[PDB]
């Protein structure tokens, strides 16, 4: 019954998961983001 | 009475049993899923 295996509340891993698909997310738009702004230094640096 | 006895303890550990794997299982299906993801984290 005394071991209790209480591995969390089921609410702890579904937070864990909901912020790790939201770090993810903004993880891809900042790489989206830095890949085009590297885009237009390059264009501005050939013009220069 | 010995029998009934018996049954009733058969009956008993069946369902223990059953509890124990219910317990065990889904923390052990829990390990997998944090392992998974953080994979993906790292």
Known sequence: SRACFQVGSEEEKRQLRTESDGLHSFFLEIKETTESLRGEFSAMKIKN | ?42
């Open chain 2, 1 to 42: 009475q010995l029998e009934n006895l018996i049954n009733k303890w058969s009956l008993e550990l069946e369902d223990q049993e059953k509890h124990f794997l219910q317990q065990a299982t889904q923390v052990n299906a829990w390990d997998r899923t944090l392992m998974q993801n953080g994979e993906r984290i790292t």
